Amino acid sequence: NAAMVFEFLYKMCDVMAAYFGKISEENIKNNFVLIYELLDEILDFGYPQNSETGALKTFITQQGIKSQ
Amino acid sequence: GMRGLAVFISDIRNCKSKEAEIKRINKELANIRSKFKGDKALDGYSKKKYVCKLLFIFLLGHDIDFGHMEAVNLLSSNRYTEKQIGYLFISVLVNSNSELIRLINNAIKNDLASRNPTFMGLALHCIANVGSREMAEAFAGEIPKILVAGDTMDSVKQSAALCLLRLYRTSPDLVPMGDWTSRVVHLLNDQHLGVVTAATSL
Amino acid sequence: MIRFILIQNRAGKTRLAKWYMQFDDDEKQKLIEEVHAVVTVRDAKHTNFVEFRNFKIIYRRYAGLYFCICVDVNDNNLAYLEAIHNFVEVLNEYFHNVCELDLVFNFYKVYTVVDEMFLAGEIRETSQTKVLKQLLMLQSLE
Amino acid sequence: SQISAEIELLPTNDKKKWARPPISMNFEVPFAPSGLKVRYLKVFEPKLNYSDHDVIKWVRYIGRSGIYETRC
């Protein structure tokens, strides 16, 4: 489903923005484990499971690094 | 030793975003422009410090369009370091001018009429590191006169061999083939080893 | 022949740009940027002889510096790599330690060393002791 | 700076008095006469997240002169 992939990408972008603000090289580099955990939780075998903030908070225990 | 460069580069390195660096570099450019215009800047060491600072300004990534006549004036000197800095500045910054190129050629021609390997080597490096039609025209018959079997030290021989190589690479039609081939060929059998390297390259 | 010699750093600043042929204004910057992009990606478990466009560069890592000589296609590969190592060792025995700070604060000495051991695009001198002796004899004379 | 002018006068009769017009001057100065000075200028972008220091900023002052009249 072509639109589903784009919608999932937008949801992932929103999740990353809520987690550690704007997407930058430093934020990605400092939060490798968080990104791996997020991709493991939001997506499995290609089915984009629910990405609600309340549901994702329970299944994710890693906290990103913020650099302003 | 030189004192102005240490403090100048030390200040310009530990700088903030490009705004502060641009402000500092423009302030230094204004200061050097004021120092070049008028005043009693006849001392060679002050010209050295200013030329080196300006060269670092250029190499940092900014454009330089002045301080060239006062820099080529450094060549006519007896201090080795002044000649070295002037030659380095001429090699780094190249411009197409009539009077300036003629003055540089005259300075180099005066330089080659010396009797010490250091000045001859510096002049040869200046000729070969840039390359130009004027240099080849005014020195087509001078480099082989150095490479011919005359009383010259080994270092200037290597420099002359590589300079003739560069001139042939850039001005193929301006290099003759007179009675110096019989000297360059037998130069390969000469003693020393770097001389053999330069002769083999040529 | 040698096209140019570069002494870069990890970030990308060019600590020594020495071109042996006439390039354009933006061409030099484009070449530096693409050489940095090519060199930085590779690691130790890779060949040092990486080719690009119509040339090939000979990159060799040293602490925080990426010495790079760009040679012609037909030119030998290992010889210029060892020339790079010889140049690095001459710098090491000259400054007593090679580092970015010494290159930045003594750029003209680096230029005169390069022109001493790399002139007109070929290898001017191949020895360390003789270059050091001739440079010291031409250092006390002022 | 000092300027000394000697102005020859025609004989005339009376009532001229030169009308005493004011002294007019024209100039521009690289600072604000009103004393206004820029203290800080920070640009913050939440989306692109670029550093404020990376924004090149140039501020220059040109104070033009209007009617600068001094009675004489």
From Swiss-Prot, chain B:
Chain residues that bind a 1,2-diacyl-sn-glycero-3-phospho-(1D-myo-inositol-3,4,5-trisphosphate): 3-4, 35, 45, 49-53
Upper classification of the organism: Eukaryota, Metazoa, Chordata, Craniata, Vertebrata
Role: Component of the adaptor protein complex 2 (AP-2). Adaptor protein complexes function in protein transport via transport vesicles in different membrane traffic pathways. Adaptor protein complexes are vesicle coat components and appear to be involved in cargo selection and vesicle formation. AP-2 is involved in clathrin-dependent endocytosis in which cargo proteins are incorporated into vesicles surrounded by clathrin (clathrin-coated vesicles, CCVs) which are destined for fusion with the early endosome.
Tissue expression notes: Expressed in the brain (at protein level).
Subcellular location: Cell membrane; Membrane, Coated pit
Phenotype when changing residue 24 to Q: Reduces phosphatidylinositol binding
Residues of the full protein shown: 9 to 210 of 938
Name of the protein this chain belongs to: AP-2 complex subunit alpha-2
UniProt family annotation: Belongs to the adaptor complexes large subunit family.
Highest taxon above the source species: Eukaryota
Subunit structure: Adaptor protein complex 2 (AP-2) is a heterotetramer composed of two large adaptins (alpha-type subunit AP2A1 or AP2A2 and beta-type subunit AP2B1), a medium adaptin (mu-type subunit AP2M1) and a small adaptin (sigma-type subunit AP2S1). Binds EPN1, EPS15, AMPH, SNAP91 and BIN1. Interacts with clathrin. Interacts with HIP1. Interacts with DGKD. Interacts with DENND1A, DENND1B and DENND1C. Interacts with FCHO1 and DAB2. Interacts with ATAT1; this interaction is required for efficient alpha-tubulin acetylation by ATAT1. Interacts with KIAA1107.
UniProtKB/Swiss-Prot annotation, chain C:
Gene3D superfamilies to which the protein is assigned, alphabetical: 3.30.450.60
Result for mutant: residue 88 to D: Abolishes interaction with CD4 endocytosis signal motif
Gene Ontology molecular-function annotations: clathrin adaptor activity
Outcome, altering residue 15 to S: Reduces interaction with CD4 endocytosis signal motif
Keyword 4Fe-4S appears in the UniProt entry: no
GO biological process: clathrin-dependent endocytosis; intracellular protein transport; postsynaptic neurotransmitter receptor internalization; synaptic vesicle endocytosis; vesicle-mediated transport
Keywords carried by this UniProt record: Cell membrane, Coated pit, Endocytosis, Membrane, Phosphoprotein, Protein transport, Transport
Alphabetized CDD domains for the sequence: AP2_sigma (cd14833)
GO CC annotations, alphabetized: AP-2 adaptor complex; cytoplasmic side of plasma membrane; postsynapse; presynapse; synapse
Annotated effect of mutating residue 92 to W: Abolishes interaction with CD4 endocytosis signal motif
Record bears the keyword Transport: yes
SUPFAM superfamilies associated with the record: SNARE-like
Superkingdom as given in the UniProt entry: Eukaryota
List of residues that carry Phosphoserine: 140
Cell location: Cell membrane; Membrane, Coated pit
Similarity annotation: Belongs to the adaptor complexes small subunit family.
Subunit and partners: Adaptor protein complex 2 (AP-2) is a heterotetramer composed of two large adaptins (alpha-type subunit AP2A1 or AP2A2 and beta-type subunit AP2B1), a medium adaptin (mu-type subunit AP2M1) and a small adaptin (sigma-type subunit AP2S1). Interacts with CCDC32; the interaction is direct and mediates association of CCDC32 with adaptor protein complex 2 (AP-2).
Protein's UniProt name: AP-2 complex subunit sigma
UniProt organism field: Mus musculus (Mouse)
Curated annotation (Swiss-Prot), chain D:
Disruption phenotype: Embryonic lethal before day 3.5 postcoitus (E3.5).
Subcellular location per the Swiss-Prot or TrEMBL entry: Cell membrane; Membrane, Coated pit
Tissue specificity field: Expressed in the brain (at protein level). Detected in spleen.
Regions annotated as coiled coil: none
Subunit details: Adaptor protein complex 2 (AP-2) is a heterotetramer composed of two large adaptins (alpha-type subunit AP2A1 or AP2A2 and beta-type subunit AP2B1), a medium adaptin (mu-type subunit AP2M1) and a small adaptin (sigma-type subunit AP2S1). Interacts with ATP6V1H and MEGF10. Interacts with EGFR and TTGN1. Interacts with F2R. Interacts with PIP5K1C isoform 1; tyrosine phosphorylation of PIP5K1C weakens the interaction. Does not interact with PIP5K1C isoform 3. Interacts with KIAA0319; required for clathrin-mediated endocytosis of KIAA0319. Interacts with DVL2 (via DEP domain).
Family affiliation: Belongs to the adaptor complexes medium subunit family.
Role, per record: Component of the adaptor protein complex 2 (AP-2). Adaptor protein complexes function in protein transport via transport vesicles in different membrane traffic pathways. Adaptor protein complexes are vesicle coat components and appear to be involved in cargo selection and vesicle formation. AP-2 is involved in clathrin-dependent endocytosis in which cargo proteins are incorporated into vesicles surrounded by clathrin (clathrin-coated vesicles, CCVs) which are destined for fusion with the early endosome.
Protein name in UniProt: AP-2 complex subunit mu
Organism the protein comes from: Mus musculus
Lineage: Eukaryota, Metazoa, Chordata, Craniata, Vertebrata
Residues shown, of full length: 364 to 435 of 435
